[PDB]
């Protein structure tokens, strides 16, 4: 039940901007698949889910060395 805190939301947004990706086109579709749920807004994530999502962006970014 515990929701995504603002700190985590910001780090996610920072990475989306650097990778040129978006919540609605990229991350929410991804999150919907891997968590087996219809997730249409960033606020529907748990913190644990958001941490996972943030981790996957960090992995993607780190390959490209993005900022």
């Amino acid at each position: 039940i515990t929701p995504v805190n603002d700190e985590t939301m910001q780090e996610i947004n920072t990475l989306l901007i650097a990778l040129d990706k978006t919540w609605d086109d990229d991350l929410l579709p991804l999150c919907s698949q891997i968590f087996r749920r219809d997730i249409r807004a960033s606020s529907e994530l748990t913190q644990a889910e958001a941490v996972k999502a943030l981790g996957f962006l960090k992995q993607k970014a780190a390959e490209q060395k993005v900022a």
């Binding site: 991804l30 891997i34 941490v51 996972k52 996957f56």
Partner: protein
């Protein structure tokens, strides 16, 4: 090798069959597959006797030909693998940046004695092996890297896949959905010409011995598809 030759030989349109399928199992009956070839290349500590694991796979594969069935081993691990394979593929695509198209079984040649079923074929020319290990223990072994992160059975599967497909490199990825972070890890494994030479010498011999055994009890390879 095409789906028309597979069709003529087996009545199975390869294009309508997807990893796990009932027909997917039929296409593999009696075939030396990548996940098992580690049994075929095991040498004895001395002499020339086939080790137990080799004889055991020899007998298993012959039984598949003569019964037309292959019982499922490690049911829970296979179900876990099936549950998470597509997420593992998507996460690999997402994090690596490389695109992955799915592939049916790929036979090395017209004989259909040798095949692999890549978990994907990548945009950069490489194949993809995907594991969703049933225990997070084995995920961690691999994730930590080092000389020994990849079990030798898995190295043989990867190298055999390149031997079957003529490819020069293969992605080996693990996914664990229970990891809070770092749940997807991959490495690139290059074609190893020492393995290629072992396959070139040992596999055709293994085939010859299988045929002699089938013939001993009046069977012909390919029967399991008629």
């Amino acid at each position: 090798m095409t789906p028309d030759i597979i069709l003529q030989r087996t009545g199975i349109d390869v294009r309508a069959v997807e990893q796990g399928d009932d027909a997917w199992h039929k296409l593999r009956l009696g075939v030396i597959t990548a996940s098992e070839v580690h049994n075929v290349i095991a040498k004895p500590r001395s002499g020339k006797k086939w080790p137990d694991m080799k004889m055991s796979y020899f007998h298993t594969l012959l039984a598949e030909v003569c019964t037309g069935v292959a019982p499922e081993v490690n049911a829970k691990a296979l179900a876990w693998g099936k549950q998470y394979e597509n997420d593992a593929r998507t996460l690999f695509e997402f994090t690596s940046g490389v695109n992955v198209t799915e592939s049916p079984i790929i036979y090395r040649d017209e004989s259909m004695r040798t095949a692999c079923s890549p978990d994907g074929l990548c945009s950069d020319g490489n194949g993809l092996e995907l594991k969703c290990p049933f225990t997070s223990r084995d995920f961690m072994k691999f994730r930590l890297g080092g000389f020994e992160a990849i079990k030798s059975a898995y190295m043989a599967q990867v190298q055999y896949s390149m031997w079957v497909t003529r490819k020069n490199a293969w992605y080996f990825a693990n996914y664990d959905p229970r990891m809070k972070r770092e749940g997807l890890h991959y490495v690139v494994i290059e074609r190893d010409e020492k393995y290629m030479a072992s396959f070139d010498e040992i596999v055709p011999e293994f085939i010859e011995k299988m045929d002699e055994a089938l013939a001993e009890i009046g069977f012909v390879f390919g029967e399991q598809w008629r």
